[PDB]
């Protein structure tokens, strides 16, 4: 069986670690909910 445990409040944190890039990808979504790269 699965169970849930509270992990915190949902709030924006000012002065948070800014990381990650913004890539524009051509993608496809299938009937099983899986994404795939189109090239």
């Amino acid at each position: 069986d699965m169970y849930i445990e509270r992990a915190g409040d949902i709030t924006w944190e000012k002065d948070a670690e800014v990381t990650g890039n913004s890539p524009r990808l051509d993608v496809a979504l299938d009937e099983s909910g899986d994404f795939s790269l189109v090239e």
Binding site: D1, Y3, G8, D9, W12, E17, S22, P23, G33
Partner: protein, 156 residues
């Protein structure tokens, strides 16, 4: 049991020890998570039970106790925060500028942050703290890195 608004870990004891298989959002008495986390199975919250209400394999979303409540959307310009809840690790806000998934049915936001699979269901937030979608369904790009979609449901 506990229905206070917030981010929650989705755990299981079917495997060795206690394993975190995903994350979810409690809002307006509704638990929101990704379909591949629970497979639509019932969840436990202390002594109480949470039964699925709505779900969809193609959207990869599922709600418990009521209809999907999250409807805020990414504005297409601003930075967002992934409130990442990693297994065995404390909740942590990570700020990023989302990219784009261009599909045959329109464009979707995308967050390029690499986290364990048990982090799926973590909410993505706007500057107001509103949940604009969930992290955990995406693609692994050429350089082995992970890129997730900003997956948002529909509020009826």
């Amino acid at each position: 049991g506990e229905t206070t608004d917030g981010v929650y870990r989705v755990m299981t004891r079917r495997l060795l020890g206690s394993t975190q298989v995903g994350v979810g959002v409690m809002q307006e008495g509704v638990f929101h998570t990704m379909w591949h986390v629970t497979k639509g199975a019932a969840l436990r919250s202390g002594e109480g039970r949470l039964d699925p209400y709505w779900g969809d394999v193609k959207q990869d979303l599922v709600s418990y106790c009521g209809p999907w409540k999250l409807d805020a959307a990414w504005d297409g310009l601003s930075e967002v925060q992934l409130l990442a809840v990693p297994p065995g690790e404390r909740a942590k806000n990570i700020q990023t500028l989302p990219g784009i998934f261009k599909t045959k049915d329109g464009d979707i936001g995308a967050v390029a942050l690499d986290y364990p699979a048990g982090t799926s269901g973590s909410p993505i937030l706007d500057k107001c703290g509103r949940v604009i979608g969930l992290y955990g369904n995406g693609v692994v790009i050429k350089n082995g890195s992970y890129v997730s979609a900003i997956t948002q449901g529909k509020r009826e």
